[PDB]
Amino acid sequence: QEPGSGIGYPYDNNTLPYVAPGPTDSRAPCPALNALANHGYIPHDGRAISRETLQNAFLNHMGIANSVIELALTNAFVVCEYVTGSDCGDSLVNLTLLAEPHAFEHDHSFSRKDYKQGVANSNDFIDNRNFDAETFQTSLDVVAGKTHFDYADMNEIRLQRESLSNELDFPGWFTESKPIQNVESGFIFALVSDFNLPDNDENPLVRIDWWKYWFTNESFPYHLGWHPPSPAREIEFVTSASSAVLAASVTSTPSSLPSGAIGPGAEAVPLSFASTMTPFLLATNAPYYAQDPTLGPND
Numbered sequence: 001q002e003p004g005s006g007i008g009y010p011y012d013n014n015t016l017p018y019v020a021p022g023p024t025d026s027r028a029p030c031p032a033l034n035a036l037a038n039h040g041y042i043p044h045d046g047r048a049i050s051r052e053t054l055q056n057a058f059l060n061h062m063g064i065a066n067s068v069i070e071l072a073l074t075n076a077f078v079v080c081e082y083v084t085g086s087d088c089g090d091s092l093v094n095l096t097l098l099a100e101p102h103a104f105e106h107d108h109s110f111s112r113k114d115y116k117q118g119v120a121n122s123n124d125f126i127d128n129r130n131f132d133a134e135t136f137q138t139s140l141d142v143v144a145g146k147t148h149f150d151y152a153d154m155n156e157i158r159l160q161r162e163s164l165s166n167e168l169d170f171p172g173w174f175t176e177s178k179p180i181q182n183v184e185s186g187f188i189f190a191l192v193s194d195f196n197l198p199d200n201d202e203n204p205l206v207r208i209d210w211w212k213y214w215f216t217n218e219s220f221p222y223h224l225g226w227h228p229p230s231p232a233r234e235i236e237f238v239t240s241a242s243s244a245v246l247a248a249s250v251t252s253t254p255s256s257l258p259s260g261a262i263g264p265g266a267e268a269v270p271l272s273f274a275s276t277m278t279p280f281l282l283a284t285n286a287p288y289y290a291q292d293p294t295l296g297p298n299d
């Protein structure tokens with residue numbers, strides 16, 4: 001928001017306004033990076049981004065401590081080298097390359113289609129990067145009619161997403177990615193769980209309208225009473241939430257689940273790519289921005 005608006009005060013005392021991405025700007029498959037870039041907390045054009053720029057942006061504007069993104073930074077630069085063919089040093093070339101499929105980006109996302117979802121021809125691919133309202137609605141409808149949801153609900157959401165993707169993706173494409181996805185499940189509980197409840201830190205409940213605002217708008221839901229977690233969330237909270245989602249009891253089982261979908265998940269670890277591998281082509285679509293309605297500087 002506009003610095004003088006005070007909308008972030010006293011949790012964020014140096015806000016910047018929302019500015020929609022233009023057609024030449026680079027955006028990510030990540031709703032957090034896209035929100036930071038839309039506010040210029042990382043470069044609005046989505047290019048040439050250092051580790052410290054990301055660390056500071058997450059810490060001072062989203063209440064996300066450095067420890068939370070340590071592995072994510074490692075993997076972002078691994079993918080940058082894989083896609084571009086050379087070491088990116090400490091200048092991530094752009095945000096778009098993070099949508100390199102079967103890498104950091106992964107199948108059965110909550111709000112994006114998969115790279116080969118519903119393609120009739122095996123060579124074809126689609127936009128696995130931009131926010132897709134119909135996909136996100138399949139996540140939201142698992143918790144339809146609710147204001148909040150818990151770990152077991154999140155487990156059901158990700159199972160629904162895995163079942164849909166395993167059925168709809170071109171045969172042989174679908175690859176389960178429980179470790180990375182459920183770090184991101186933890187990220188959701190870290191950012192938009194309801195800190196107004198007395199037991200938030202130990203038994204967090206996601207506030208659904210905050211989640212939907214953040215994902216749909218790629219900006220922060222201050223108008224709904226959200227503010228950055230204070231103190232900033234740390235990695236222990238995120239991986240404990242990840243664990244608890246995957247440990248939660250499943251009351252409703254979708255068909256067509258990949259083998260082992262129900263049960264614990266491996267620790268997420270650094271990515272690696274054989275130097276012989278050539279990257280899949282990135283989807284070229286212009287960056288998504290909210291248009292129903294378009295957002296103003298303070299939204």
Ligand code: HEM
Nearest residue numbers: 029030032069072076098104105106109110111112184187
């Ligand atoms: C350097 C830091 C980060 C990088 C490089 C990064 C990268 C990514 C990538 C490549 C994806 C796509 C995975 C997929 O296919 O869905 C993603 C998704 C996601 N990210 Fe980020 N991430 C970072 C930090 C964060 C943080 C701190 C949060 C929240 C506190 C966050 C929230 C999410 C969520 C919720 C998704 C899942 C979107 C979906 O499934 O539709 N990310 N991130």
Ligand SMILES: *[C@@H]1O[C@H](CO)[C@@H](O[C@@H]2O[C@H](CO)[C@@H](O)[C@H](O)[C@H]2NC(C)=O)[C@H](O)[C@H]1NC(C)=O
Nearest residue numbers: 209212213214216217223290293295296298299
């Ligand atoms: C996306 O952002 C907009 C803008 O903040 C959200 O809310 C609208 O806000 C403007 C005024 O700021 C008005 O059009 C309405 O009061 C809001 N619309 C409503 C309440 O439906 C919009 O709701 C956000 N989208 C999501 C999915 O949260």
Ligand SMILES: *[C@@H]1O[C@H](CO)[C@@H](O[C@@H]2O[C@H](CO)[C@@H](O)[C@H](O)[C@H]2NC(C)=O)[C@H](O)[C@H]1NC(C)=O
Nearest residue numbers: 025026027083084093094096097279280281282
């Ligand atoms: C982000 O960077 C990637 C990697 O450099 C760009 O993808 C390459 O773009 C060139 C065209 O300039 C193509 O020849 C390559 O085939 C692309 N690589 C892949 C793996 O598809 C991408 O265009 C950049 N995106 C933005 C929005 O700047």
Ligand SMILES: *[C@H]1O[C@H](CO)[C@@H](O)[C@H](O)[C@@H]1O[C@H]1O[C@H](CO)[C@@H](O)[C@H](O)[C@@H]1O
Nearest residue numbers: 023024125126127282283284285286287
């Ligand atoms: C991205 O750009 C490529 C070169 O134009 C296309 O071959 C791809 O299909 C992809 O096209 C999509 O995005 C472009 C914007 O660059 C639009 O012009 C297309 O209509 C399509 O949505």
Ligand SMILES: *[C@@H]1O[C@H](CO)[C@@H](O)[C@H](O)[C@H]1NC(C)=O
Nearest residue numbers: 009010011012013014060230
């Ligand atoms: C914002 O400013 C107020 C007033 O000086 C201060 O009390 C508060 O600690 C500041 N918040 C942060 C996160 O620095």
Ligand SMILES: *[C@H]1O[C@H](CO)[C@@H](O)[C@H](O)[C@@H]1O
Nearest residue numbers: 179182183242243265266
């Ligand atoms: C989130 O983190 C937990 C704990 O490391 C994993 O078990 C899970 O697979 C996801 O990576």
Ligand SMILES: *[C@H]1O[C@H](CO)[C@@H](O)[C@H](O)[C@@H]1O
Nearest residue numbers: 235236238239240243267
């Ligand atoms: C989540 O999981 C990690 C290991 O992946 C732990 O280090 C953390 O304390 C939390 O239990």
Ligand SMILES: *[C@H]1O[C@H](CO)[C@@H](O)[C@H](O)[C@@H]1O
Nearest residue numbers: 201202203237240241244
């Ligand atoms: C790890 O931490 C999370 C968040 O505090 C808890 O919900 C979980 O039960 C475990 O203690």
Ligand SMILES: *[C@H]1O[C@H](CO)[C@@H](O)[C@H](O)[C@@H]1O
Nearest residue numbers: 239240242243244247264
């Ligand atoms: C969360 O908790 C599970 C089991 O409690 C662990 O296996 C995982 O490493 C993370 O600490």
Ligand SMILES: *[C@H]1O[C@H](CO)[C@@H](O)[C@H](O)[C@@H]1O
Nearest residue numbers: 152247248249250251252
């Ligand atoms: C744990 O608990 C649910 C009920 O909440 C059971 O139905 C399920 O089979 C799981 O074992």
Ligand SMILES: *[C@H]1O[C@H](CO)[C@@H](O)[C@H](O)[C@@H]1O
Nearest residue numbers: 142152153156250251252
């Ligand atoms: C069991 O509970 C889950 C959520 O934990 C629901 O998704 C399901 O429909 C059943 O009521």
Ligand SMILES: *[C@H]1O[C@H](CO)[C@@H](O)[C@H](O)[C@@H]1O
Nearest residue numbers: 142156160251252253254
């Ligand atoms: C219970 O919930 C799962 C996931 O929401 C569904 O796939 C199932 O059919 C039932 O509605």
Ligand SMILES: *[C@H]1O[C@H](CO)[C@@H](O)[C@H](O)[C@@H]1O
Nearest residue numbers: 249250251252253254262
């Ligand atoms: C649906 O079915 C699975 C077995 O496929 C159970 O693990 C789950 O708890 C639910 O009963």
Ligand SMILES: *[C@H]1O[C@H](CO)[C@@H](O)[C@H](O)[C@@H]1O
Nearest residue numbers: 163252253254255256257
């Ligand atoms: C997948 O298959 C099972 C029965 O095998 C059902 O529970 C579900 O409705 C879907 O048809």
Ligand SMILES: *[C@H]1O[C@H](CO)[C@@H](O)[C@H](O)[C@@H]1O
Nearest residue numbers: 176257258259260261263
């Ligand atoms: C079905 O296939 C998977 C392979 O990912 C196993 O993990 C599972 O135990 C079952 O054999």
Ligand SMILES: *[C@H]1O[C@H](CO)[C@@H](O)[C@H](O)[C@@H]1O
Nearest residue numbers: 270271272273274275276
């Ligand atoms: C990480 O691991 C891969 C194997 O999957 C190697 O090929 C790569 O060079 C790096 O050591």
